[PDB]
Hints:
This is part of a larger assembly, with chains A, B, C, D, E and F. By secondary structure, chain B is α+β, with helices and mostly antiparallel strands. In chain B, 38% of the residues lie in helices and 6% in strands. In chain B, strands 2-1-3-5-4 form a five-stranded antiparallel β-sheet, covered by helices on one side. In chain B, a hairpin with a 7-residue loop joins strand 4 and strand 5. The longest helix of chain B is centred in the first third of the chain and has 16 residues. The two termini of chain B are 31 Å apart. By secondary structure, chain C is α+β, with helices and mostly antiparallel strands. In chain C, helix 2 crosses helix 3. In chain E, strands 1, 2, 3, 4, 5 and 6 form a six-stranded mixed β-sheet that branches. Chain E is built from three helices and six strands, in the order βββββαβαα. By secondary structure, chain E is an alpha+beta fold. Chains in contact: A-D, A-F, B-C, C-F. Chains B and C meet through helix 4 and helix 8 of B and loops of C. The structure holds magnesium ion (37 copies). Chain D binds two RNA strands through helix 1. Chain F: Keywords: Ribonucleoprotein, Ribosomal protein, RNA-binding, rRNA-binding.
Amino acid sequence: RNQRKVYTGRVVSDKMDKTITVVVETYKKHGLYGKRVKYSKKFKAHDENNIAKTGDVVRISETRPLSATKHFRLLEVVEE
Amino acid sequence: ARYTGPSWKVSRRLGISLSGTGKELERRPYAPGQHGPTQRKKISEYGLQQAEKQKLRHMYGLTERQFKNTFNKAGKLQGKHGENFMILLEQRLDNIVYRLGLARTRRAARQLVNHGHITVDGKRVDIPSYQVSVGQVISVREKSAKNSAIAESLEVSSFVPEYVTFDAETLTGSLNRLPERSELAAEINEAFIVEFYSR
Amino acid sequence: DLEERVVTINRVAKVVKGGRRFRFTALVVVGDKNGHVGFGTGKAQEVPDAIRKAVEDAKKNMVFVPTVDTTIPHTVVGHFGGGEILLKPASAGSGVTAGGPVRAVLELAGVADVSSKSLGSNTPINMVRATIDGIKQLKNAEDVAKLRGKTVEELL
Amino acid sequence: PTINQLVRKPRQSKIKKSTSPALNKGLNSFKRELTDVNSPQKRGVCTRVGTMTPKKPNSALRKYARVRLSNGIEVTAYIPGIGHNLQEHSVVLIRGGRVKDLPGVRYHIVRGALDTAGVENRGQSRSKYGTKKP
Amino acid sequence: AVKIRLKRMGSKKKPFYRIVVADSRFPRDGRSIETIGTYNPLLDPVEVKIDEEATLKWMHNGAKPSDTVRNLLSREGIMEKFHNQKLG
Amino acid sequence: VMTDPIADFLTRIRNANMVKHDKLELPASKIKKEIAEILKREGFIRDVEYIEDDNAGTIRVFLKYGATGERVITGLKRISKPGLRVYAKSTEVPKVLNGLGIAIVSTSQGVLTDKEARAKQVGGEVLAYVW
RNA sequence: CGGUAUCUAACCAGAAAGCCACGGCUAACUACGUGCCAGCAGCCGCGGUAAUACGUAGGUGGCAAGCGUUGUCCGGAUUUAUUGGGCGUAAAGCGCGCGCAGGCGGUCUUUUAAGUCUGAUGUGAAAGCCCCCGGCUUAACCGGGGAGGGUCAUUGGAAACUG
RNA sequence: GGUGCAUUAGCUAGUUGGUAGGGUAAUGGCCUACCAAGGCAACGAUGCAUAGCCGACCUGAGAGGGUGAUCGGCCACACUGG
Ligand SMILES: [Mg+2]
Ligand SMILES: [Mg+2]
Ligand SMILES: [Mg+2]
Ligand SMILES: [Mg+2]
Ligand SMILES: [Mg+2]
Ligand SMILES: [Mg+2]
Ligand SMILES: [Mg+2]
Ligand SMILES: [Mg+2]
Ligand SMILES: [Mg+2]
Ligand SMILES: [Mg+2]
Ligand SMILES: [Mg+2]
Ligand SMILES: [Mg+2]
Ligand SMILES: [Mg+2]
Ligand SMILES: [Mg+2]
Ligand SMILES: [Mg+2]
Ligand SMILES: [Mg+2]
Ligand SMILES: [Mg+2]
Ligand SMILES: [Mg+2]
Ligand SMILES: [Mg+2]
Ligand SMILES: [Mg+2]
Ligand SMILES: [Mg+2]
Ligand SMILES: [Mg+2]
Ligand SMILES: [Mg+2]
Ligand SMILES: [Mg+2]
Ligand SMILES: [Mg+2]
Ligand SMILES: [Mg+2]
Ligand SMILES: [Mg+2]
Ligand SMILES: [Mg+2]
Ligand SMILES: [Mg+2]
Ligand SMILES: [Mg+2]
Ligand SMILES: [Mg+2]
Ligand SMILES: [Mg+2]
Ligand SMILES: [Mg+2]
Ligand SMILES: [Mg+2]
Ligand SMILES: [Mg+2]
Ligand SMILES: [Mg+2]
Ligand SMILES: [Mg+2]
């Protein structure tokens, strides 16, 4: 069975129902000079029962589009 | 004969006696023109590099554009760029006929190849710039055969280089092997040729 | 028996009451193709006499250039005042690729294949100084092992 | 600068400036707007022919023209060669090239391309000035 | 309907064909699925090089040789194999 | 403050060469041990000793000069600075001064010179050029 | 396409050479005419009754079925400098402090494996540059094979360095 | 992953999420009713200007700089709007 893609980030906002906003931090070297730089773009994940809280560290997996913006689902809550 | 002008001044201007000797010396050995006998002058670095190009170009008698093209593909080989240039030029069908003794000068040899008078491997070839390989046989294929001009030039042939084999009964010339730089010209500075094209 | 090559002849002047007095300065590179080269400077009221002074001067700055396979052992960078020269080894048969006054110190020295680039000023006297400042840094492989206590085959 | 400084704002290079602004400009009559296309020559009808004097220390009299280009820009050109045949209301071809002596002249009128004719009795360098083989 | 056909390439009056597998809809010298072999008609004994394995794989998936290809494959002799593997 | 202890090792040796100092000592570290130990393998330094103390220990290096006082080390350079780290693949390992010098590489098999790295097909961080 | 390509038979040196430069940069110089006029010019700048710089001749030098000019792009330009520059007097250290975000961070041990290095699999079409062969009488040109090309995806390792 | 402007600082309201239904070959504010007030942005939203994208082409010692005609792949358009 082919496997989807799983990320890991930090919850930012839970003011919406059934969903959370997760920022994923990642590295990428600059094109010409060659220095690693922080890069963060936040996603949307599906919180089935509002388990995750602000500031938690979670794992999210890719799915079919659940909404206009959500296409990830929450998998684990690693840290609180 | 791409350059049909007098082939006597070019030896005088260059200072080297093309085709053996006599064109430069004996007569006026100084440069042609009104200001030949007097009014000498120094030569800069550009002049020395440029004058080396002119010797090879006018010795083998070929145009500028070909000279640039054959220089580029000569340097694609393995070894010294300058030495590979004379080796590659030595391969030309004009020079081989000149080396065999069927013609007196390179201009005579070029016309001889041009007017379908020779054959390689039994097939007529009319391209002067054909690159001969090692082992191929070159003949005349009868027709002209006992021609007065070709037979006259056979007698006045001095010597024959060791990398070409030719007997004057079947006129079957051949290249024994690829020649060596030491046994070519020896009065040209190939290091100046390669420096000229790198500016 | 060495070889001479006049690089630059320049006319200079100092101002004195009545008018200007002019003098000629000549820069000459001298050496044999076996590996010895030197440069000098002269000054006189005539061009032929400025060369003769510079030839004698140049016979007092002789330096030795180490080469392997008609090429410098490695890459060096000269530096003297506002001029600096980069010298780089090149493949056999390529020939010397150098600027105006730096060709003389290389053709006379006997180097047959070397590439260079003048990254600094343009003054002929400071290009000759900056070039010799690079030949000083030049070392052979045989002498490097001697200092480091190794052997030649161990180094390479 | 430091690498971090050189990442926050990178290096911006200088921009060159063309010396022949009128030659590299176009026009659209439907829209009445200049379009940006390069071109080696342009033509136009000259509105005034005359001379002025060059800057010091030269002292000659240089023969110029005042041409209105096909794209609607008024420029000043220069007639080379000895003697011409230009008059007001004449169509000529101009090409790039600045003359040093003249203050404002930045273009050259090509000779032998249109109403402007070649130079009379030219024996050598005839490709310029547009004089045919005698 | 994917079918195997020639593809013209070369110079003026010196054609040289490269046997390809492509749909009928796509241009003659455009998209193709994959290449099987070549064909030189100028050589008086016409010489052809074929995969003899990708062809048989394709012809069991709905691929049909064209008029000239069928002559090539028959002369080379793999339509016999297509016969034998069909019934066997 | 101190942002690059390895650079100090590189520059202390260079500063002592100019004045022909016969020895020097400096605070010790685990990484400096191999760098100092490597230099002794190719004769760049005449000796090295360790002194054990409370804080971190101390290392002294004995510089080497040829007969008639020629420097054995003619230059030291730091490559992978804290501001811009560099990494080299197996085939990207350089040759300092056309094989007459050495480069110190911190591979995954330990800290070892450029010549040895190309014999094991490993890469890492290039630390210093010594020639 | 098309009696096209290609052969053989004969007669003819006969129908087939121009363009730009010659003070320096930059290879190539002498006469005559003009007299700050006519004019030349990419820069330095030449011409004011002995101009190697303007115009024409003779000669020469670069190319050649071409040769020159203009327009646009890269180079030389280290003249935006990661490779590869600088800030006392040449352009260039804020008038000085307190400090959020960000960037960087002393010594040792254990662990982890994000950065780092390495193997396998899939893929990065064809054509093009490059390498090796072959066909057009040679070349251009055209075929066959290969190579290169990714901060790519799955998976297995290493633990020195940053985290 | 591949462009200029901060002398362009706020933008958005089917917008952001949820519940039920409609519709589609198919998931989905794609659409509708209800409920809540959210979502994006100095890691450059929004706005103005310019532009089809790529394999590739020219130049360059290289790193890069400029271009995207011919040949091949994808896209959009067919007098101007629906
Ligand atoms: Mg002129
Ligand atoms: Mg047939
Ligand atoms: Mg017929
Ligand atoms: Mg025949
Ligand atoms: Mg006849
Ligand atoms: Mg000259
Ligand atoms: Mg006169
Ligand atoms: Mg001139
Ligand atoms: Mg003149
Ligand atoms: Mg003449
Ligand atoms: Mg001529
Ligand atoms: Mg031609
Ligand atoms: Mg042209
Ligand atoms: Mg131009
Ligand atoms: Mg640059
Ligand atoms: Mg500067
Ligand atoms: Mg400072
Ligand atoms: Mg001041
Ligand atoms: Mg100042
Ligand atoms: Mg201050
Ligand atoms: Mg902080
Ligand atoms: Mg640390
Ligand atoms: Mg930190
Ligand atoms: Mg490909
Ligand atoms: Mg062949
Ligand atoms: Mg091809
Ligand atoms: Mg191929
Ligand atoms: Mg560890
Ligand atoms: Mg482990
Ligand atoms: Mg994007
Ligand atoms: Mg629903
Ligand atoms: Mg919507
Ligand atoms: Mg926008
Ligand atoms: Mg460059
Ligand atoms: Mg590139
Ligand atoms: Mg078109
Ligand atoms: Mg229309």
